[PDB]
Design a protein around this ligand. Structure first.
Ligand SMILES: C=C(NCc1c(COP(=O)(O)O)cnc(C)c1O)C(=O)O
Ligand SMILES: C=C(NCc1c(COP(=O)(O)O)cnc(C)c1O)C(=O)O
Ligand SMILES: O=S1(=O)C[C@H](O)[C@@H](N2CCN(c3ccccc3Cl)CC2)C1
Ligand SMILES: O=S1(=O)C[C@H](O)[C@@H](N2CCN(c3ccccc3Cl)CC2)C1
Ligand SMILES: [K+]
Ligand SMILES: [K+]
Ligand SMILES: [K+]
Ligand SMILES: [K+]
Lengths: 249, 404, 404, 249
């Protein structure tokens, strides 16, 4: 019927603002610290938490996250730690989705991972290297276990593929990346009313405010990793500023 | 002859074997526009007589095709008195089979109006081939190469620069072939509208496994004609080394529907398959998604890629092409491990017996051919793809045999 | 089968008269084995079974015929003339040297010799000799000047991998002429069992004729290929000239075509006016040197002037007697090409056609560019690309600032 | 008529002794010192002096003579210095022949060199890299200017070539080459009465005495250069021993 992240975006349009979607990778700088950091995100105003599964070859990730996830793997992070982080986030009141490359899901079992993600309180899956063309197992598991499926669109997406990608998505669509970011959201807005998250290397309250004027959600990841590296107090402050920026529009 | 599709082709999505789902496109949506563009251009030009003429002309007058088939009678006593036939891809321009696939893709890049070509390289042979075609066709060229491979294949780094290609040394991960592929991917994502990605092996997302194989099919087509003319019959076995799988699938493919021809691929076992320092993808790997395709890879219990190790830069890769995974599941091809020591022994033996210095990659296939000859016995006919020459490996081999 | 004897010398080895070019300026200590080699070659050159053995190795082992490639992207740098490259760089071992080595090694085998020696400058003839000796089970000893072992070190290591003993020569100028002196010393000491596999179209009878006869295949193929591709005989055929083996090999098939110009390009080093060059015909005079009467660089007393060239294969103060005869007769013109002209041509062939030539061959490419301007638009010029430049990659990278 | 060296061998065979034939290169260690050493050879009992012309590429010379000729050429030795050495040897009552590679003769001019050598008192020419097959010019100049022509035979010489080489020689035949040396001399004696000199790396009186049993002349070269390198007195001493060895009674 309705998406799991629906109420979150509805509450944000009611409060005349965009959602703050924060990414942190599990196990950086260690599993307990990362979970303490993700809890801090919930308390500091993050509407949605993206729990990142560290991957050995993250070609889509920039240098900040790639080095953090690489340090997490040197520390021994396992996929089960991400499910434990989702549970800790749900228990603390937050709303958690998981962002992962697809092979860790394949190795886990697509159905079994959706089952365990749901049981942990997870609400959806962001799949940067899974396109709908290969998403047969995931569409079935997404429906069975009532999980949102957040696919990515790009500025280079053909009209046909953008339509098929939006149609296959539940919860929101990740508009991954100048006027290219608003143009991409507009092309999504022309075919569906599904919320649109925009990731754009957001670093400051002002940049979050700019994106809040046209996007349903503002996605911050690299900046949160950089902040946590300086210290947990620095992460708390930056998140508070980002929570202010999404309210200005 | 790439205009005619075979019954071994994947579906429109790039899947082999129907329900098993080998291959496909495990790529971000950000590359699907250009990947579909490359797919449409390949399907258009593969049946264009102007394109086929250009490719035939370059293969003959520029690359030196056909490569000969040579019966290495001095090897016979070391292969159970079997008859070893060497398909001499080492004589191609630039010194390996890579030029076959590169000439096809570089011409396609020109047809698509792309102005910039990127490529990964491990041994440096695909990098030299790509740099070669870009100099010939006047295209900008950037090669990604792992920092460890720039050191142990330094001859090819310097050849690439002399040909006008830019070389980016990759220092992330294992600093070898899979890390160069990661970096070339990142380049393509950023520069898709003007850049053609000239991928060097029979893996990746559709259309690359099929397209690369199609440009390499010429090897096995020539070999099947040459063995019937020289030996009077089809071979008992056709063997080749397997990294990503391009030279093996190129010599295998013409023999697929010959039910009496054994097909054997030999993969790099490094220090040994029990040591965790190997690249024996089929021996020790398992199914999964990696580098745009669903195939076999070395992976841990969470699905993280395990880093490969091999004395051979060209085989030092934890993945393998999906059509090979399909051929393994069907039982048509057998895949077997060959260690560093076995390969280097075959390296020196080929030097002393036939006066041919092979690529350390191809020495794996010679090593496996020797063992298969002992299996099959006297008079058995074994065709071996000699994928490249060992100029790039002369330093490594000299240190191995104490000739310094 | 065998080609005619029209341009051949007399039984004493003299071109153009009984006391003309060539002959045998050797000690009586070698005349027994030299007469033996002469008789062995006279017998086998008319034996269809010997020519069948040689043809079989050239086709399936060495990869002949080598293609003829029209280097269209060179045209505008050669006065809009059309440059065709005879691609001997694609032969097994990477040069034309293998043609002569395969014939002489088969001969050494027919004579029952068990030990083969040879000189080498660029290392291509040494590698080829080591290659055939491995192929045929012969013990092999290569002599190479110490300066050459340093600037062609890739080939030193190739020779050792093939099982040959490489002896660094430290006497004289430590280059090609001095390796020849040491190989000479070896032969008189080991005349009983050792065959001397000489690498260029020089020395005492029968070597100028035997080497040319084994290299004739280049010009025979090129004469057919150029008529098929250009529709007519070429306006000029050009090659680089050290001792003269690759030049005479491609020239010979065109000697009786009175409209085909023939030009050989010799190495001028720093310049012919500097005394650091190898321009034997430009700055030399007739005299007896290394077993023949020909041109050489010599001072007023007849002492040999040491040569210099960036190209180890052309760094030789002498030249073969048949070239002296062809020059005196006015059939072939010989011109100098400097280090800088060659390296310009080297780099131009790299970035325009994607071919890395031997620095020796770059002299011929350089001369063809100049000749193309003289002949002008439309002229058909066949160039012998005698070898590839893997051996010269380090030298070329330094010249062009690609290593620092 | 008889050969220019016929008298010497006739006088030696009457004295029941072989001729002592001594080689020294011109210009080693310098031009004046080499002429002094060749003079000492005449004074110390050397019947025939072989005046060596240094050559840039002496393939037939051992390391001792090759090093000496290299040094002589570095000192600027000229072919004309060899003609001066022959003059001095003739003036001291000696008998000189020139041993030379053939190309310096060609650059000089075969007739010119044979004329000037005969003028300087020279008695013959030894041509180690000139076989009779190429010696048409030299045979003409040799007869014109009354010069002996000494060709070399080797243990490997075919019966036809040994016979032709012996027929072409005047003065003596250089038998260059442990039973090979007497067997070679025997093959020459079977076809001709011409004197036969033997080179054999002679360095002691004993070896010279062994050779004088069957040879008409004992040729010494490398040992003399070695002795000269140590000093002129060492040269006279060694030559005296060699002069004693060639005498039988
Ligand atoms: C990796 C590349 N080399 C692989 C290679 C291989 C293995 O690659 P295949 O694509 O499996 O054929 C075999 N032989 C030679 C001579 C090679 O160079 C390269 O040059 O980039
Ligand atoms: C001297 C040697 N090579 C000479 C050479 C030459 C000159 O040799 P010719 O005999 O003049 O053809 C030309 N091209 C190449 C590639 C060469 O290697 C050698 O390898 O011993
Ligand atoms: O999304 S990823 O991080 C996970 C996925 O495995 C990565 N591969 C890397 C290799 N690549 C590729 C290979 C050969 C030819 C062409 C391409 Cl595009 C596809 C995607 C990026
Ligand atoms: O007697 S020498 O010092 C003067 C003579 O010119 C020297 N050459 C050089 C070597 N050589 C030769 C060349 C190629 C093949 C075979 C040979 Cl035998 C003939 C003799 C020695
Ligand atoms: K048949
Ligand atoms: K056969
Ligand atoms: K592999
Ligand atoms: K020369």
């Amino acid at each position: 019927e309705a998406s799991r992240l629906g109420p979150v975006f509805d509450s944000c349009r009611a409060n005349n603002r965009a959602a703050l979607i924060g990414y942190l990778p599990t196990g950086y700088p260690d599993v307990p610290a990362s979970v303490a950091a993700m809890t801090a995100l919930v308390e500091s105003g993050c509407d949605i938490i993206e729990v990142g599964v560290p991957y050995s070859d993250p070609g889509m990730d920039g240098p900040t996250i790639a080095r953090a996830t690489e340090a997490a793997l040197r520390g021994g992070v396992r996929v089960r730690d991400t499910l434990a982080a989702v549970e800790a986030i749900s228990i603390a009141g937050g709303r958690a989705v998981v962002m992962t490359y697809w092979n860790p899901v394949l190795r886990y079992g697509v159905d079994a991972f959706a089952r365990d993600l749901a049981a942990a309180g997870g609400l959806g899956l962001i799949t940067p290297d899974l396109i709908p063309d290969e998403a047969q197992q995931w569409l079935a598991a997404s429906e069975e276990h009532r999980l949102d499926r957040i696919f990515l669109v790009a500025p280079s997406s053909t009209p046909e593929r953008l339509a098929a990608t939006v149609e296959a998505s539940r919860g929101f669509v990740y508009a991954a990346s100048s006027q290219a970011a608003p143009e991409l959201v507009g092309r999504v807005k022309a075919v569906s009313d599904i919320p649109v998250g925009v990731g754009l290397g957001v670093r400051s309250r002002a940049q979050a405010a700019q994106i809040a004027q046209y996007a349903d959600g503002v996605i911050v990841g690299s900046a949160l990793v950089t902040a946590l590296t300086e210290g947990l107090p620095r992460l708390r402050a930056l998140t508070g500023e980002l929570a202010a920026g999404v309210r200005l529009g | 002859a790439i205009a005619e599709p075979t019954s071994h082709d994947p579906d429109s999505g790039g899947h082999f074997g129907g329900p098993s789902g080998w291959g496909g496109r495990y790529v971000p949506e950000a590359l699907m526009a250009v990947i579909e563009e490359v797919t449409a251009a390949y399907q258009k030009e593969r049946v264009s007589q102007d394109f086929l003429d250009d490719l035939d002309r370059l293969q003959a007058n520029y690359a030196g095709r056909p490569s000969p088939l040579y019966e290495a009678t001095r090897l016979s006593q070391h292969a159970g008195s079997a008859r070893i036939f060497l398909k001499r891809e080492d004589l191609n321009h630039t010194g390996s089979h890579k030029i076959n696939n590169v000439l096809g893709q570089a011409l396609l890049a020109r047809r698509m109006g792309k102005t910039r070509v990127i490529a990964e390289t491990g041994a440096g042979q695909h990098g030299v081939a790509t740099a070669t075609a870009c100099a010939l066709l006047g295209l900008d060229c950037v090669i990604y190469m792992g920092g460890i491979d720039t050191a142990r294949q330094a001859l090819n780094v310097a050849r690439m620069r002399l040909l006008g290609a830019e070389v980016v040394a990759v220092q992330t991960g294992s600093k070898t072939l899979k890390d160069a592929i990661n970096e070339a991917f990142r380049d393509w994502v950023a520069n898709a509208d003007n850049t053609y990605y000239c991928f060097g092996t029979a893996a990746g997302p559709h259309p690359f496994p099929t397209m690369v194989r199609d440009f390499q099919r010429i090897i096995g087509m020539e070999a099947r004609v040459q063995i019937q003319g020289q030996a009077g019959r089809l071979p008992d076995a056709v063997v080749a080394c397997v990294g990503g799988g391009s030279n093996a699938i190129g010599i295998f493919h013409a023999f697929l529907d010959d039910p009496g021809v054994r097909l054997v691929g030999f993969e790099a076992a490094g220090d040994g398959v029990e040591t965790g320092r190997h690249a024996a993808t089929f021996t020790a790997g398992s199914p999964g998604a990696f580098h745009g395709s669903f195939s076999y890879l070395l992976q841990d219990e969470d699905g993280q890629t395990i880093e490969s190790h091999s004395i051979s830069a060209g085989l030092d890769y934890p993945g393998v092409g999906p059509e090979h995974a399909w051929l393994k599941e069907a039982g048509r091809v057998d895949y077997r491990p060959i260690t560093d020591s076995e390969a280097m022994d075959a390296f020196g033996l080929l030097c002393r017996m036939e006066g041919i210095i092979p690529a350390i990659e191809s020495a794996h296939a010679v090593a496996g051919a020797l063992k298969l000859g002992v299996e099959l016995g006297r008079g058995a006919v074994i065709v071996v793809n000699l994928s490249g020459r060992g100029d790039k490996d002369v330093e490594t081999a000299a240190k191995w045999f104490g000739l310094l």
